[PDB]
Amino acid sequence: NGIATLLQAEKEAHEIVSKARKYRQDKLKQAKTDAAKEIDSYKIQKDKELKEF
Amino acid sequence: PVTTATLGITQVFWGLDKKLAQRKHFPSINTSVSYSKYTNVLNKFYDSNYPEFPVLRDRMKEILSNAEELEQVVQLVGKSALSDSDKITLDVATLIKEDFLQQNGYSTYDAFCPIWKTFDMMRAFISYHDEAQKAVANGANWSKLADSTGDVKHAVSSSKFFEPSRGEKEVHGEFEKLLSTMQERFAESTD
């Protein structure tokens, strides 16, 4: 009957919701990694100063 | 006397346990009494390669010690008074002992678990413990979380079956995929 179609659309959209959250969460993990890369440059600059000392 | 005169001179002590040996828990290293005085020296190498290795090592030693003390208490006072965090510590350390510390030599997969696979498995175990504790702190009950994340727990325990002969790049990729699956499973369970 039509009940299966009603549930399938909600189930299909729910799966996309989890994928959207997972992709956004993955981007958050990537953003932290990218931010740490900028911090690593400061550590690299500090290391060069330590080498100069 | 030979053991004492050897401990007085050797810098490492891989004390074996007969009780763990009987259960085929191998190599049966008694983590309570064993020590290595070279951990401080090896910081200069673990910083160059595998920077998080010492942090993971102290974290797993903390987990094992805490769960050893807790199991000692439970053996005489029952598991009724344990909190959810303590139960997670017990389960995580049992998983560590039965799937990471135990290394079945004379087997194809775990004859030689090299440093990179050891570090990745160590990261997987520590991340499982940390994320389980975060999930229980978020309000999720541990009894339900165990059934919800049995798949993640078995994937972690089965990570030792990744044959190191597949190459450092391949096994590292499999461990990254396993960590992603673990994070997704906990996110779905705690949602």
Side-chain angles (χ1 to χ4, degrees), chain B residues 106 108-109 111-129:
Chain B
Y106 315 117
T108 292
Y109 50 97
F112 177 73
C113 182
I115 192 66
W116 39 271
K117 181 187 156 197
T118 295
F119 168 55
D120 289 331
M121 188 171 337
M122 200 164 171
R123 201 145 46 85
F125 277 63
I126 282 296
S127 180
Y128 173 83
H129 170 258

mmCIF file of all heavy atoms in Angstrom, chain B residues 106-130, unseen atoms left out:
data_model
loop_
_atom_site.group_PDB
_atom_site.id
_atom_site.type_symbol
_atom_site.label_atom_id
_atom_site.label_comp_id
_atom_site.label_asym_id
_atom_site.label_seq_id
_atom_site.Cartn_x
_atom_site.Cartn_y
_atom_site.Cartn_z
ATOM 1 N N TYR B 106 53.279 -17.630 16.101
ATOM 2 C CA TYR B 106 52.983 -18.811 15.292
ATOM 3 C C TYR B 106 51.622 -18.692 14.614
ATOM 4 O O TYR B 106 50.915 -19.685 14.431
ATOM 5 C CB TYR B 106 53.055 -20.098 16.118
ATOM 6 C CG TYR B 106 54.262 -20.167 17.012
ATOM 7 C CD1 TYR B 106 54.127 -20.208 18.389
ATOM 8 C CD2 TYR B 106 55.540 -20.187 16.478
ATOM 9 C CE1 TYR B 106 55.232 -20.270 19.206
ATOM 10 C CE2 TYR B 106 56.648 -20.248 17.285
ATOM 11 C CZ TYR B 106 56.489 -20.289 18.648
ATOM 12 O OH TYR B 106 57.601 -20.349 19.452
ATOM 13 N N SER B 107 51.247 -17.468 14.255
ATOM 14 C CA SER B 107 50.056 -17.196 13.469
ATOM 15 C C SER B 107 50.440 -16.277 12.322
ATOM 16 O O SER B 107 51.384 -15.493 12.430
ATOM 17 C CB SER B 107 48.952 -16.557 14.312
ATOM 18 N N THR B 108 49.710 -16.392 11.213
ATOM 19 C CA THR B 108 50.057 -15.626 10.020
ATOM 20 C C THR B 108 49.942 -14.128 10.268
ATOM 21 O O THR B 108 50.839 -13.355 9.914
ATOM 22 C CB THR B 108 49.162 -16.045 8.853
ATOM 23 O OG1 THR B 108 49.470 -17.390 8.471
ATOM 24 C CG2 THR B 108 49.373 -15.125 7.662
ATOM 25 N N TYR B 109 48.843 -13.699 10.883
ATOM 26 C CA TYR B 109 48.589 -12.272 11.036
ATOM 27 C C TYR B 109 49.461 -11.641 12.115
ATOM 28 O O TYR B 109 50.030 -10.567 11.901
ATOM 29 C CB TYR B 109 47.108 -12.034 11.336
ATOM 30 C CG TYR B 109 46.553 -12.882 12.458
ATOM 31 C CD1 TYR B 109 46.457 -12.383 13.745
ATOM 32 C CD2 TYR B 109 46.113 -14.176 12.225
ATOM 33 C CE1 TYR B 109 45.953 -13.151 14.770
ATOM 34 C CE2 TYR B 109 45.606 -14.951 13.245
ATOM 35 C CZ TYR B 109 45.527 -14.434 14.516
ATOM 36 O OH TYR B 109 45.018 -15.202 15.536
ATOM 37 N N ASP B 110 49.592 -12.286 13.274
ATOM 38 C CA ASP B 110 50.203 -11.659 14.440
ATOM 39 C C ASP B 110 51.525 -12.307 14.837
ATOM 40 O O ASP B 110 51.859 -12.361 16.021
ATOM 41 C CB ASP B 110 49.237 -11.675 15.622
ATOM 42 N N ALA B 111 52.286 -12.809 13.868
ATOM 43 C CA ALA B 111 53.653 -13.215 14.171
ATOM 44 C C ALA B 111 54.538 -12.000 14.395
ATOM 45 O O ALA B 111 55.407 -12.005 15.273
ATOM 46 C CB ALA B 111 54.213 -14.083 13.046
ATOM 47 N N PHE B 112 54.319 -10.948 13.613
ATOM 48 C CA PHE B 112 55.117 -9.724 13.656
ATOM 49 C C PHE B 112 54.192 -8.528 13.489
ATOM 50 O O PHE B 112 53.832 -8.174 12.365
ATOM 51 C CB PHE B 112 56.190 -9.739 12.579
ATOM 52 C CG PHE B 112 56.997 -8.482 12.513
ATOM 53 C CD1 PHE B 112 57.930 -8.180 13.483
ATOM 54 C CD2 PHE B 112 56.849 -7.617 11.446
ATOM 55 C CE1 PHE B 112 58.682 -7.024 13.409
ATOM 56 C CE2 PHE B 112 57.599 -6.463 11.362
ATOM 57 C CZ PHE B 112 58.516 -6.165 12.347
ATOM 58 N N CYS B 113 53.820 -7.908 14.599
ATOM 59 C CA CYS B 113 53.061 -6.673 14.503
ATOM 60 C C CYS B 113 54.030 -5.504 14.597
ATOM 61 O O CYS B 113 54.463 -5.143 15.697
ATOM 62 C CB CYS B 113 52.001 -6.590 15.594
ATOM 63 S SG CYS B 113 50.981 -5.115 15.486
ATOM 64 N N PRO B 114 54.383 -4.886 13.476
ATOM 65 C CA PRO B 114 55.452 -3.882 13.486
ATOM 66 C C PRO B 114 55.054 -2.612 14.211
ATOM 67 O O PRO B 114 53.960 -2.526 14.776
ATOM 68 C CB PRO B 114 55.702 -3.625 11.999
ATOM 69 C CG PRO B 114 54.416 -3.934 11.359
ATOM 70 C CD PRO B 114 53.781 -5.034 12.143
ATOM 71 N N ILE B 115 55.941 -1.619 14.202
ATOM 72 C CA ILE B 115 55.710 -0.422 15.000
ATOM 73 C C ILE B 115 54.538 0.389 14.459
ATOM 74 O O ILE B 115 53.749 0.938 15.232
ATOM 75 C CB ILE B 115 56.999 0.410 15.099
ATOM 76 C CG1 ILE B 115 56.843 1.487 16.173
ATOM 77 C CG2 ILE B 115 57.404 0.970 13.744
ATOM 78 C CD1 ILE B 115 56.702 0.931 17.560
ATOM 79 N N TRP B 116 54.382 0.468 13.136
ATOM 80 C CA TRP B 116 53.301 1.287 12.596
ATOM 81 C C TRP B 116 51.938 0.651 12.847
ATOM 82 O O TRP B 116 50.988 1.341 13.238
ATOM 83 C CB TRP B 116 53.513 1.545 11.105
ATOM 84 C CG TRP B 116 54.047 0.387 10.338
ATOM 85 C CD1 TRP B 116 55.355 0.071 10.141
ATOM 86 C CD2 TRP B 116 53.284 -0.599 9.639
ATOM 87 N NE1 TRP B 116 55.458 -1.061 9.371
ATOM 88 C CE2 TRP B 116 54.198 -1.490 9.048
ATOM 89 C CE3 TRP B 116 51.918 -0.818 9.456
ATOM 90 C CZ2 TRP B 116 53.790 -2.582 8.290
ATOM 91 C CZ3 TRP B 116 51.517 -1.902 8.707
ATOM 92 C CH2 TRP B 116 52.448 -2.772 8.133
ATOM 93 N N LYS B 117 51.819 -0.662 12.641
ATOM 94 C CA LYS B 117 50.556 -1.327 12.943
ATOM 95 C C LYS B 117 50.275 -1.313 14.437
ATOM 96 O O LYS B 117 49.121 -1.167 14.852
ATOM 97 C CB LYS B 117 50.559 -2.758 12.413
ATOM 98 C CG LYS B 117 49.258 -3.501 12.667
ATOM 99 C CD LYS B 117 49.369 -4.962 12.283
ATOM 100 C CE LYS B 117 48.365 -5.807 13.041
ATOM 101 N NZ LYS B 117 48.708 -7.255 13.002
ATOM 102 N N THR B 118 51.312 -1.463 15.264
ATOM 103 C CA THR B 118 51.116 -1.374 16.705
ATOM 104 C C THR B 118 50.613 0.003 17.104
ATOM 105 O O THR B 118 49.693 0.122 17.915
ATOM 106 C CB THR B 118 52.413 -1.694 17.443
ATOM 107 O OG1 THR B 118 52.769 -3.061 17.215
ATOM 108 C CG2 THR B 118 52.242 -1.468 18.927
ATOM 109 N N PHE B 119 51.193 1.054 16.527
ATOM 110 C CA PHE B 119 50.758 2.409 16.841
ATOM 111 C C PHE B 119 49.326 2.647 16.387
ATOM 112 O O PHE B 119 48.539 3.269 17.106
ATOM 113 C CB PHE B 119 51.710 3.415 16.200
ATOM 114 C CG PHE B 119 51.213 4.824 16.224
ATOM 115 C CD1 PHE B 119 50.844 5.422 17.411
ATOM 116 C CD2 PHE B 119 51.127 5.557 15.057
ATOM 117 C CE1 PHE B 119 50.390 6.719 17.432
ATOM 118 C CE2 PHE B 119 50.674 6.855 15.073
ATOM 119 C CZ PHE B 119 50.304 7.438 16.263
ATOM 120 N N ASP B 120 48.959 2.157 15.201
ATOM 121 C CA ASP B 120 47.588 2.350 14.737
ATOM 122 C C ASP B 120 46.588 1.581 15.594
ATOM 123 O O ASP B 120 45.524 2.112 15.933
ATOM 124 C CB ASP B 120 47.465 1.953 13.270
ATOM 125 C CG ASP B 120 48.163 2.927 12.350
ATOM 126 O OD1 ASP B 120 48.245 4.120 12.708
ATOM 127 O OD2 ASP B 120 48.630 2.506 11.272
ATOM 128 N N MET B 121 46.902 0.336 15.953
ATOM 129 C CA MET B 121 46.015 -0.425 16.829
ATOM 130 C C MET B 121 45.900 0.236 18.193
ATOM 131 O O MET B 121 44.821 0.271 18.796
ATOM 132 C CB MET B 121 46.529 -1.855 16.972
ATOM 133 C CG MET B 121 45.591 -2.786 17.704
ATOM 134 S SD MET B 121 46.137 -4.495 17.606
ATOM 135 C CE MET B 121 47.142 -4.425 16.131
ATOM 136 N N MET B 122 47.012 0.760 18.692
ATOM 137 C CA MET B 122 47.029 1.464 19.961
ATOM 138 C C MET B 122 46.140 2.695 19.905
ATOM 139 O O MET B 122 45.372 2.967 20.837
ATOM 140 C CB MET B 122 48.477 1.830 20.257
ATOM 141 C CG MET B 122 48.845 2.145 21.657
ATOM 142 S SD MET B 122 50.635 2.029 21.628
ATOM 143 C CE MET B 122 51.034 2.676 23.221
ATOM 144 N N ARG B 123 46.223 3.443 18.803
ATOM 145 C CA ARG B 123 45.361 4.602 18.614
ATOM 146 C C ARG B 123 43.901 4.192 18.559
ATOM 147 O O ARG B 123 43.043 4.865 19.133
ATOM 148 C CB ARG B 123 45.753 5.347 17.341
ATOM 149 C CG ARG B 123 45.284 6.788 17.301
ATOM 150 C CD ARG B 123 46.291 7.679 16.600
ATOM 151 N NE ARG B 123 46.760 7.095 15.350
ATOM 152 C CZ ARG B 123 46.132 7.210 14.187
ATOM 153 N NH1 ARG B 123 45.001 7.887 14.076
ATOM 154 N NH2 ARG B 123 46.652 6.631 13.109
ATOM 155 N N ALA B 124 43.598 3.089 17.872
ATOM 156 C CA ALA B 124 42.214 2.629 17.790
ATOM 157 C C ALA B 124 41.668 2.270 19.165
ATOM 158 O O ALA B 124 40.552 2.666 19.519
ATOM 159 C CB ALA B 124 42.109 1.434 16.846
ATOM 160 N N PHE B 125 42.447 1.539 19.963
ATOM 161 C CA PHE B 125 41.989 1.156 21.296
ATOM 162 C C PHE B 125 41.796 2.379 22.189
ATOM 163 O O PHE B 125 40.775 2.507 22.884
ATOM 164 C CB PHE B 125 42.982 0.184 21.929
ATOM 165 C CG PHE B 125 42.788 -1.243 21.513
ATOM 166 C CD1 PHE B 125 42.940 -1.621 20.197
ATOM 167 C CD2 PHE B 125 42.457 -2.206 22.442
ATOM 168 C CE1 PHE B 125 42.765 -2.930 19.817
ATOM 169 C CE2 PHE B 125 42.280 -3.515 22.067
ATOM 170 C CZ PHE B 125 42.434 -3.878 20.754
ATOM 171 N N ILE B 126 42.767 3.294 22.182
ATOM 172 C CA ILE B 126 42.668 4.480 23.028
ATOM 173 C C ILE B 126 41.495 5.348 22.596
ATOM 174 O O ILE B 126 40.764 5.888 23.434
ATOM 175 C CB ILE B 126 43.992 5.261 23.012
ATOM 176 C CG1 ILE B 126 45.005 4.577 23.919
ATOM 177 C CG2 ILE B 126 43.780 6.692 23.470
ATOM 178 C CD1 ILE B 126 44.588 4.575 25.367
ATOM 179 N N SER B 127 41.297 5.500 21.287
ATOM 180 C CA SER B 127 40.172 6.282 20.798
ATOM 181 C C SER B 127 38.852 5.635 21.179
ATOM 182 O O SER B 127 37.890 6.333 21.509
ATOM 183 C CB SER B 127 40.268 6.454 19.285
ATOM 184 O OG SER B 127 39.176 7.210 18.795
ATOM 185 N N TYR B 128 38.781 4.304 21.138
ATOM 186 C CA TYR B 128 37.558 3.627 21.555
ATOM 187 C C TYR B 128 37.253 3.922 23.013
ATOM 188 O O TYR B 128 36.120 4.264 23.366
ATOM 189 C CB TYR B 128 37.679 2.123 21.322
ATOM 190 C CG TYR B 128 36.528 1.324 21.880
ATOM 191 C CD1 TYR B 128 35.348 1.184 21.168
ATOM 192 C CD2 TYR B 128 36.622 0.703 23.115
ATOM 193 C CE1 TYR B 128 34.293 0.453 21.672
ATOM 194 C CE2 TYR B 128 35.572 -0.029 23.627
ATOM 195 C CZ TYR B 128 34.410 -0.152 22.902
ATOM 196 O OH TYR B 128 33.363 -0.883 23.411
ATOM 197 N N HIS B 129 38.266 3.821 23.873
ATOM 198 C CA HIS B 129 38.049 4.117 25.287
ATOM 199 C C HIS B 129 37.610 5.563 25.485
ATOM 200 O O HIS B 129 36.633 5.839 26.195
ATOM 201 C CB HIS B 129 39.316 3.839 26.085
ATOM 202 C CG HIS B 129 39.256 4.339 27.492
ATOM 203 N ND1 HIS B 129 39.874 5.502 27.893
ATOM 204 C CD2 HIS B 129 38.647 3.837 28.590
ATOM 205 C CE1 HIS B 129 39.651 5.693 29.181
ATOM 206 N NE2 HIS B 129 38.909 4.697 29.627
ATOM 207 N N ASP B 130 38.319 6.500 24.856
ATOM 208 C CA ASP B 130 38.027 7.915 25.059
ATOM 209 C C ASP B 130 36.639 8.271 24.549
ATOM 210 O O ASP B 130 35.895 9.000 25.213
ATOM 211 C CB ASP B 130 39.088 8.773 24.373
#
